[PDB]
Amino acid sequence: TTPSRRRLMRDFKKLQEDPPAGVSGAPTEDNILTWEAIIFGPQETPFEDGTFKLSLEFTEEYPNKPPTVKFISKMFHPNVYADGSICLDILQNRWSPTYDVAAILTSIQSLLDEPNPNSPANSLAAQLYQENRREYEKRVQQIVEQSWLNF
DSSP: OOHHHHHHHHHHHHHHHSOOTTEEEEEETTEEEEEEEEEEOOTTSTTTTOEEEEEEEOOTTTTTSOOEEEESSOOOOTTBOTTOBBOOGGGTTSOOTTOOHHHHHHHHHHTTSSOOOSSOSOHHHHHHHHHOHHHHHHHHHHHHHHHTTTO
């Protein structure tokens, strides 16, 4: 009945009434603080056809403090760490307690075809993205197919 859980319940209600395209997610049945979500690869991009599973972990400090979001499906992206951790400014220092699960997933969806070049978490990817966009798309297609083994 804590404030964090109450907000997360509202987050779910809003996400269900009007879910963004290619975006869905729900709290694990044993812990509302831990969710699971799915982001479909944006339409006309190299991530096209992707079915990416994500994990979202909230603390009791939510919504004041952002959750940590990691891709469960394998990933190849400039802003994604080896453990699947997503490096996204709104989850770090540009975080606003007004952002909800729908907004977070939507941003991560947009981040797919528009990598933040500030500080890559994945070097090989930031390199191929700028210096060999053909090899980059090859390895992304490899991740797209593997993402099907998840859902």
